[PDB]
PDB file of N, CA and C and ligand atoms in Angstrom:
ATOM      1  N   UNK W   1      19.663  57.171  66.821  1.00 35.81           N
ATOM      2  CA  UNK W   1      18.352  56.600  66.523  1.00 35.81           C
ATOM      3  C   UNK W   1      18.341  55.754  65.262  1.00 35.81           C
ATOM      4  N   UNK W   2      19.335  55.110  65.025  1.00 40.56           N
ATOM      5  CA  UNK W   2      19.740  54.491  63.155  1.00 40.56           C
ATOM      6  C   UNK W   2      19.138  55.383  62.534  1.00 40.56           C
ATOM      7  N   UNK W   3      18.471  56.613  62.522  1.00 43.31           N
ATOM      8  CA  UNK W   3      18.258  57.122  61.721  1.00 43.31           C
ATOM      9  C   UNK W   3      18.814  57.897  60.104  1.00 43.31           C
ATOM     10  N   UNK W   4      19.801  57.037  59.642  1.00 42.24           N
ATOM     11  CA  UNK W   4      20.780  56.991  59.094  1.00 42.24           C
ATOM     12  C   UNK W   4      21.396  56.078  58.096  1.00 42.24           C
ATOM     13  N   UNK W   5      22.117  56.659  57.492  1.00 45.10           N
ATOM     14  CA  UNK W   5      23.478  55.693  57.019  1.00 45.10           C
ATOM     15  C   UNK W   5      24.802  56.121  57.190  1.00 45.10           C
ATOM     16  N   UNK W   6      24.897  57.349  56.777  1.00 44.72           N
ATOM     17  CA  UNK W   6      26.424  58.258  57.724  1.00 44.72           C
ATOM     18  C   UNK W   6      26.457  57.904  59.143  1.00 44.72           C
ATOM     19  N   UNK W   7      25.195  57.598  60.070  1.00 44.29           N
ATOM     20  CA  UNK W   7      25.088  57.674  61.359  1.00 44.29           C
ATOM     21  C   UNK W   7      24.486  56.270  61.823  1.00 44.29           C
ATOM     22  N   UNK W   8      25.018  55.463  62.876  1.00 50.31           N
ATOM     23  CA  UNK W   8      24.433  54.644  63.825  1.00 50.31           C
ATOM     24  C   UNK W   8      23.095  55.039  65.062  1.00 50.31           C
ATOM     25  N   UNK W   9      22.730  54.404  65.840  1.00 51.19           N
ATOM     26  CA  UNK W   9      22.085  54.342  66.635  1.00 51.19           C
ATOM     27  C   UNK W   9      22.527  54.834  67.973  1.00 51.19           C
ATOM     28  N   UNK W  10      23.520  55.357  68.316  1.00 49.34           N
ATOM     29  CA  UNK W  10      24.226  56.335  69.203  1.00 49.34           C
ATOM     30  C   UNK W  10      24.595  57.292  68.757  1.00 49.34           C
ATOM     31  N   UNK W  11      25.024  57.172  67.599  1.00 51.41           N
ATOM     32  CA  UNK W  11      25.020  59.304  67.032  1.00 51.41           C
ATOM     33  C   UNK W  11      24.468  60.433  68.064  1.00 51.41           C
ATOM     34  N   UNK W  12      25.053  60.645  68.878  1.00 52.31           N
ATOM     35  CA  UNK W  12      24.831  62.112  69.639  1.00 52.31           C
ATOM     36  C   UNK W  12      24.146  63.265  68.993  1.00 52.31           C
ATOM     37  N   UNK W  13      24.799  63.868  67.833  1.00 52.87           N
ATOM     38  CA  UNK W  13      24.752  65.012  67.018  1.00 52.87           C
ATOM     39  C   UNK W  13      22.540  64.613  66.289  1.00 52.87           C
ATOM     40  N   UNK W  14      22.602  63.537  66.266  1.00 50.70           N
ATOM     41  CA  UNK W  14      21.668  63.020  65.935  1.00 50.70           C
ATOM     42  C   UNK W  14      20.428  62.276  66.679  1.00 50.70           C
ATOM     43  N   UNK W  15      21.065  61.614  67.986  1.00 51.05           N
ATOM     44  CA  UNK W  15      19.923  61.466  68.837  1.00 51.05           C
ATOM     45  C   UNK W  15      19.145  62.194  69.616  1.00 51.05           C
ATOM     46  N   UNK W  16      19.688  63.467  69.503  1.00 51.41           N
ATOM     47  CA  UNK W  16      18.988  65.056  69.762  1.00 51.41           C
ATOM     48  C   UNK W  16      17.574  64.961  68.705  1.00 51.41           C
ATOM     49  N   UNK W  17      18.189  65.139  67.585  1.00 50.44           N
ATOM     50  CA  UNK W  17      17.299  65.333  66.552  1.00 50.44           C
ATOM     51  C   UNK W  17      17.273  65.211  64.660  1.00 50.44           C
ATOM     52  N   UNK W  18      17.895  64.382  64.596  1.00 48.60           N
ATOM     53  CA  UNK W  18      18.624  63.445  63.599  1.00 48.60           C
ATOM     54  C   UNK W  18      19.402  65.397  62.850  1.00 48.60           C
ATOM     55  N   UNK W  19      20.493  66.034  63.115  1.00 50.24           N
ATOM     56  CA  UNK W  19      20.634  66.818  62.565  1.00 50.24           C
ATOM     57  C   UNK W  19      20.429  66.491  60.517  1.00 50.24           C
ATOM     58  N   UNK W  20      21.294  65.633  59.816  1.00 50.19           N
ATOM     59  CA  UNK W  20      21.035  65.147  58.652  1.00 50.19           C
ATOM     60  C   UNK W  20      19.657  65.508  57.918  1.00 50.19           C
ATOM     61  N   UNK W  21      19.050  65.721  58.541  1.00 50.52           N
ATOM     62  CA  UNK W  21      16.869  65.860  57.882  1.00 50.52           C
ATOM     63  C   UNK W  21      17.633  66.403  56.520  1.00 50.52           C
ATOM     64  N   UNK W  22      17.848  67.874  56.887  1.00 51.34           N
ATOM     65  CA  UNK W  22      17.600  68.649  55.188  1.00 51.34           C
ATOM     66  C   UNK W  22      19.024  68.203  54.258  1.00 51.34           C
ATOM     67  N   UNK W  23      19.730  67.380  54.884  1.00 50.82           N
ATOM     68  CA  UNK W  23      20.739  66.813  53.759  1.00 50.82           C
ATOM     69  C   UNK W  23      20.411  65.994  52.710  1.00 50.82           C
ATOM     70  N   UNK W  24      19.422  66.409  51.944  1.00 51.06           N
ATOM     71  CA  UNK W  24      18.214  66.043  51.024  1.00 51.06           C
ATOM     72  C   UNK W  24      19.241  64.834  49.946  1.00 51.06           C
ATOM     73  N   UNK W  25      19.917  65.279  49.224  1.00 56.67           N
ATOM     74  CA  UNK W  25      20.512  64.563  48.446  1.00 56.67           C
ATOM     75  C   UNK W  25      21.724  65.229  48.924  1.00 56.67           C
ATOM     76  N   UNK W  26      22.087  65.174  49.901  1.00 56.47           N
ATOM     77  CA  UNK W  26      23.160  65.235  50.585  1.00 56.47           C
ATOM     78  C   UNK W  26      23.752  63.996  50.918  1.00 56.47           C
ATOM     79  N   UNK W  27      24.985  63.831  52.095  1.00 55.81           N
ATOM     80  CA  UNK W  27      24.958  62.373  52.743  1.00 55.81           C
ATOM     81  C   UNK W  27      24.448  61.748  53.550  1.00 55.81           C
ATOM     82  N   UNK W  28      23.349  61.569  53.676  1.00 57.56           N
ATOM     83  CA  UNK W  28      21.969  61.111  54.264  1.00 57.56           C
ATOM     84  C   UNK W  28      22.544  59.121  54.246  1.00 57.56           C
ATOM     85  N   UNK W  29      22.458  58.976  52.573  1.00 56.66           N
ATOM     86  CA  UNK W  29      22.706  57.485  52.345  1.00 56.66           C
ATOM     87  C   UNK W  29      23.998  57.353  52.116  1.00 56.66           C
ATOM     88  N   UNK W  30      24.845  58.300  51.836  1.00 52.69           N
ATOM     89  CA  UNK W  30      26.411  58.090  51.734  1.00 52.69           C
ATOM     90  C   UNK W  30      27.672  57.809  52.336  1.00 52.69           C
ATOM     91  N   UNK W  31      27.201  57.260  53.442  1.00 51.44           N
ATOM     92  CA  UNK W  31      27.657  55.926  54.378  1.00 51.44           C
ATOM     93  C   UNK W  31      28.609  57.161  55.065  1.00 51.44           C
ATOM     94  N   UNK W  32      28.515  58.039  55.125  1.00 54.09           N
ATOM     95  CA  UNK W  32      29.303  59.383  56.026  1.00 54.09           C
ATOM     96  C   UNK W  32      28.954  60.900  55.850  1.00 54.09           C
ATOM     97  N   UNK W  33      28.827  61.744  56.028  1.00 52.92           N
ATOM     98  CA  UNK W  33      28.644  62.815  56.323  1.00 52.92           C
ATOM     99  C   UNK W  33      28.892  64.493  56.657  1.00 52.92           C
ATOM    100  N   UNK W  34      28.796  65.187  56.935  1.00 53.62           N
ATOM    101  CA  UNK W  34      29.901  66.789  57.160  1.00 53.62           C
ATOM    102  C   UNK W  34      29.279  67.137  58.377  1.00 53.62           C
ATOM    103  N   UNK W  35      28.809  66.576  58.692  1.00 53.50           N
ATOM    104  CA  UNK W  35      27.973  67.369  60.490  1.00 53.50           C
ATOM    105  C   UNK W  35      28.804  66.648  61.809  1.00 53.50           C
ATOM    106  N   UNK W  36      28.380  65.599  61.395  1.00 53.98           N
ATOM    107  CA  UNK W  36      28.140  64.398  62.475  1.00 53.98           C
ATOM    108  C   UNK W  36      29.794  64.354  62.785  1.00 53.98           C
ATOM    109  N   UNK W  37      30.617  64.231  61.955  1.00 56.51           N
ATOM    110  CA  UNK W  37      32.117  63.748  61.751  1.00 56.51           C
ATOM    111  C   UNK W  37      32.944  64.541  62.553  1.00 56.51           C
TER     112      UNK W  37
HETATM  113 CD1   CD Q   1      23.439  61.010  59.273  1.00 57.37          CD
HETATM  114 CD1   CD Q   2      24.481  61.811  62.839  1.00 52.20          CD
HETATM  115 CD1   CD Q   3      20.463  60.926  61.699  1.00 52.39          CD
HETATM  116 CD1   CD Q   4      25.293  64.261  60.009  1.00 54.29          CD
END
């Protein structure tokens, strides 16, 4: 859902339901991530 910057607009893990939400100052904007990967 681009809901993202670790993640594109096909992200699986995320077009469910953007998993990332509570990665508050997590890698949300840090162009990658620990879920999604
Ligand atoms: Cd993400
Ligand atoms: Cd994702
Ligand atoms: Cd997301
Ligand atoms: Cd993620």
């Amino acid at each position: 859902k681009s809901c993202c910057s670790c993640c594109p607009a096909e992200c699986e893990k995320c077009a469910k339901d953007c998993v990332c939400k509570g990665g508050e100052a997590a890698e949300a904007e840090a162009e990658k991530c620990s879920c999604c990967q």
